[PDB]
Amino acid sequence: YEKNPMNMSIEIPEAFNMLPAQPKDLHFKVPCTSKCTGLTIYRPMTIVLITGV
Amino acid sequence: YEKNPMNMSIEIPEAFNMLPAQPKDLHFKVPCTSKCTGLTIYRPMTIVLITGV
Known part of the structure:
Protein backbone atom coordinates (compact mmCIF):
# COMPACT_ATOMS: atom_id res chain seq x y z
CA TYR A 1 0.00 0.00 0.00
CA GLU A 2 0.99 3.65 -0.11
CA LYS A 3 1.03 5.39 3.26
CA ASN A 4 -0.60 8.83 3.25
CA PRO A 5 -3.07 10.51 5.52
CA MET A 6 -4.92 11.40 2.31
CA ASN A 7 -5.99 7.82 1.45
CA MET A 8 -6.59 6.41 4.96
CA SER A 9 -6.69 7.69 8.52
CA ILE A 10 -7.57 6.78 12.10
CA GLU A 11 -8.98 9.37 14.49
CA ILE A 12 -9.27 9.47 18.29
CA PRO A 13 -11.34 12.58 19.16
CA GLU A 14 -11.09 11.87 22.92
CA ALA A 15 -8.34 10.10 24.86
CA PHE A 16 -8.46 7.87 27.93
CA ASN A 17 -10.11 9.48 30.96
CA MET A 18 -10.88 8.28 34.49
CA LEU A 19 -13.84 9.63 36.44
CA PRO A 20 -13.66 10.06 40.23
CA ALA A 21 -14.60 7.17 42.52
CA GLN A 22 -18.23 6.48 43.45
CA PRO A 23 -18.35 5.12 47.01
CA LYS A 24 -20.66 2.31 48.12
CA ASP A 25 -20.99 0.39 51.40
CA LEU A 26 -17.27 0.08 52.17
CA HIS A 27 -16.04 -0.08 48.55
CA PHE A 28 -15.77 2.03 45.39
CA LYS A 35 -13.69 7.46 21.97
CA CYS A 36 -12.34 6.15 18.66
CA THR A 37 -13.33 6.04 14.99
CA GLY A 38 -11.60 3.16 13.19
CA LEU A 39 -9.83 2.87 9.87
CA THR A 40 -11.55 4.57 6.93
CA ILE A 41 -10.24 4.01 3.40
CA TYR A 42 -10.72 7.03 1.15
CA ARG A 43 -9.29 5.85 -2.15
CA PRO A 44 -9.98 2.10 -1.95
CA MET A 45 -7.36 1.08 -4.51
CA THR A 46 -4.03 2.12 -3.05
CA ILE A 47 -4.13 -1.14 -1.05
CA VAL A 48 -3.24 -4.59 -2.37
CA LEU A 49 -3.62 -7.73 -0.25
CA ILE A 50 -1.91 -11.02 -1.12
CA THR A 51 -3.79 -13.98 0.36
CA GLY A 52 -2.39 -17.45 1.07
CA VAL A 53 1.31 -16.67 1.57
CA TYR B 1 -8.33 -15.10 87.92
CA GLU B 2 -5.52 -12.57 88.32
CA LYS B 3 -5.76 -9.31 86.36
CA ASN B 4 -2.44 -8.41 84.71
CA PRO B 5 -1.54 -7.28 81.17
CA MET B 6 0.92 -10.20 80.81
CA ASN B 7 -1.69 -12.86 81.65
CA MET B 8 -4.60 -11.95 79.34
CA SER B 9 -5.55 -9.08 77.06
CA ILE B 10 -8.20 -7.77 74.66
CA GLU B 11 -6.96 -5.76 71.69
CA ILE B 12 -8.69 -3.22 69.44
CA PRO B 13 -6.45 -2.55 66.40
CA GLU B 14 -8.85 0.04 64.92
CA ALA B 15 -11.25 2.15 66.97
CA PHE B 16 -14.83 3.13 66.19
CA ASN B 17 -15.02 5.18 62.98
CA MET B 18 -17.96 6.75 61.15
CA LEU B 19 -17.54 6.76 57.38
CA PRO B 20 -18.61 9.86 55.42
CA ALA B 21 -22.34 10.15 54.72
CA GLN B 22 -23.58 8.77 51.39
CA PRO B 23 -26.49 10.87 50.05
CA LYS B 24 -29.45 9.13 48.38
CA ASP B 25 -32.31 11.43 47.36
CA LEU B 26 -33.38 13.43 50.43
CA HIS B 27 -31.78 11.20 53.08
CA PHE B 28 -28.36 9.84 54.01
CA LYS B 35 -12.01 -4.19 64.54
CA CYS B 36 -11.39 -6.50 67.50
CA THR B 37 -9.57 -9.75 68.27
CA GLY B 38 -10.98 -11.27 71.46
CA LEU B 39 -9.52 -12.58 74.69
CA THR B 40 -6.05 -14.13 74.48
CA ILE B 41 -4.78 -16.17 77.43
CA TYR B 42 -0.99 -15.97 77.56
CA ARG B 43 -0.65 -17.77 80.91
CA PRO B 44 -3.47 -20.32 81.39
CA MET B 45 -2.34 -21.36 84.90
CA THR B 46 -3.87 -18.26 86.53
CA ILE B 47 -7.54 -18.93 85.68
CA VAL B 48 -9.94 -21.39 87.32
CA LEU B 49 -13.51 -22.01 86.14
CA ILE B 50 -16.45 -23.22 88.21
CA THR B 51 -18.92 -24.60 85.66
CA GLY B 52 -22.27 -26.18 86.48
CA VAL B 53 -23.89 -23.43 88.54
Whole structure:
Protein backbone atom coordinates (compact mmCIF):
# COMPACT_ATOMS: atom_id res chain seq x y z
CA TYR A 1 0.00 0.00 0.00
CA GLU A 2 0.99 3.65 -0.11
CA LYS A 3 1.03 5.39 3.26
CA ASN A 4 -0.60 8.83 3.25
CA PRO A 5 -3.07 10.51 5.52
CA MET A 6 -4.92 11.40 2.31
CA ASN A 7 -5.99 7.82 1.45
CA MET A 8 -6.59 6.41 4.96
CA SER A 9 -6.69 7.69 8.52
CA ILE A 10 -7.57 6.78 12.10
CA GLU A 11 -8.98 9.37 14.49
CA ILE A 12 -9.27 9.47 18.29
CA PRO A 13 -11.34 12.58 19.16
CA GLU A 14 -11.09 11.87 22.92
CA ALA A 15 -8.34 10.10 24.86
CA PHE A 16 -8.46 7.87 27.93
CA ASN A 17 -10.11 9.48 30.96
CA MET A 18 -10.88 8.28 34.49
CA LEU A 19 -13.84 9.63 36.44
CA PRO A 20 -13.66 10.06 40.23
CA ALA A 21 -14.60 7.17 42.52
CA GLN A 22 -18.23 6.48 43.45
CA PRO A 23 -18.35 5.12 47.01
CA LYS A 24 -20.66 2.31 48.12
CA ASP A 25 -20.99 0.39 51.40
CA LEU A 26 -17.27 0.08 52.17
CA HIS A 27 -16.04 -0.08 48.55
CA PHE A 28 -15.77 2.03 45.39
CA LYS A 29 -16.36 1.98 41.63
CA VAL A 30 -14.16 3.87 39.15
CA PRO A 31 -15.53 4.10 35.58
CA CYS A 32 -13.45 4.77 32.48
CA THR A 33 -14.29 5.96 28.97
CA SER A 34 -12.77 7.05 25.64
CA LYS A 35 -13.69 7.46 21.97
CA CYS A 36 -12.34 6.15 18.66
CA THR A 37 -13.33 6.04 14.99
CA GLY A 38 -11.60 3.16 13.19
CA LEU A 39 -9.83 2.87 9.87
CA THR A 40 -11.55 4.57 6.93
CA ILE A 41 -10.24 4.01 3.40
CA TYR A 42 -10.72 7.03 1.15
CA ARG A 43 -9.29 5.85 -2.15
CA PRO A 44 -9.98 2.10 -1.95
CA MET A 45 -7.36 1.08 -4.51
CA THR A 46 -4.03 2.12 -3.05
CA ILE A 47 -4.13 -1.14 -1.05
CA VAL A 48 -3.24 -4.59 -2.37
CA LEU A 49 -3.62 -7.73 -0.25
CA ILE A 50 -1.91 -11.02 -1.12
CA THR A 51 -3.79 -13.98 0.36
CA GLY A 52 -2.39 -17.45 1.07
CA VAL A 53 1.31 -16.67 1.57
CA TYR B 1 -8.33 -15.10 87.92
CA GLU B 2 -5.52 -12.57 88.32
CA LYS B 3 -5.76 -9.31 86.36
CA ASN B 4 -2.44 -8.41 84.71
CA PRO B 5 -1.54 -7.28 81.17
CA MET B 6 0.92 -10.20 80.81
CA ASN B 7 -1.69 -12.86 81.65
CA MET B 8 -4.60 -11.95 79.34
CA SER B 9 -5.55 -9.08 77.06
CA ILE B 10 -8.20 -7.77 74.66
CA GLU B 11 -6.96 -5.76 71.69
CA ILE B 12 -8.69 -3.22 69.44
CA PRO B 13 -6.45 -2.55 66.40
CA GLU B 14 -8.85 0.04 64.92
CA ALA B 15 -11.25 2.15 66.97
CA PHE B 16 -14.83 3.13 66.19
CA ASN B 17 -15.02 5.18 62.98
CA MET B 18 -17.96 6.75 61.15
CA LEU B 19 -17.54 6.76 57.38
CA PRO B 20 -18.61 9.86 55.42
CA ALA B 21 -22.34 10.15 54.72
CA GLN B 22 -23.58 8.77 51.39
CA PRO B 23 -26.49 10.87 50.05
CA LYS B 24 -29.45 9.13 48.38
CA ASP B 25 -32.31 11.43 47.36
CA LEU B 26 -33.38 13.43 50.43
CA HIS B 27 -31.78 11.20 53.08
CA PHE B 28 -28.36 9.84 54.01
CA LYS B 29 -26.65 6.59 55.00
CA VAL B 30 -23.74 6.51 57.43
CA PRO B 31 -21.75 3.27 57.94
CA CYS B 32 -19.74 2.51 61.07
CA THR B 33 -16.95 -0.04 61.48
CA SER B 34 -14.30 -1.21 63.95
CA LYS B 35 -12.01 -4.19 64.54
CA CYS B 36 -11.39 -6.50 67.50
CA THR B 37 -9.57 -9.75 68.27
CA GLY B 38 -10.98 -11.27 71.46
CA LEU B 39 -9.52 -12.58 74.69
CA THR B 40 -6.05 -14.13 74.48
CA ILE B 41 -4.78 -16.17 77.43
CA TYR B 42 -0.99 -15.97 77.56
CA ARG B 43 -0.65 -17.77 80.91
CA PRO B 44 -3.47 -20.32 81.39
CA MET B 45 -2.34 -21.36 84.90
CA THR B 46 -3.87 -18.26 86.53
CA ILE B 47 -7.54 -18.93 85.68
CA VAL B 48 -9.94 -21.39 87.32
CA LEU B 49 -13.51 -22.01 86.14
CA ILE B 50 -16.45 -23.22 88.21
CA THR B 51 -18.92 -24.60 85.66
CA GLY B 52 -22.27 -26.18 86.48
CA VAL B 53 -23.89 -23.43 88.54
